[PDB]
Amino acid sequence: XLXRXXX
């Protein structure tokens, strides 16, 4: 959820 480069 933070950022899909990575929840």
**Number of strand elements:** 0
Strand content: under 5%
Oligomer status: monomer
Give the helix level as a range of percent: under 10%
Summarize the main sheet.
Answer: none
What structural class do helix, strand and pairing data support? little secondary structure
The gross shape turns out to be globular
Number of helices, counting only DSSP H or I runs of 4 residues or more = 0
Question: What's the Cα radius of gyration?
Answer: 4 Å
Distance between the termini: 4 Å
PDB class: hydrolase inhibitor, toxin
Keywords: toxin, hydrolase inhibitor
Assembly: monomeric
Entry title: NMR structure of cyanobacterial toxin, phosphatase-1/-2A inhibitor
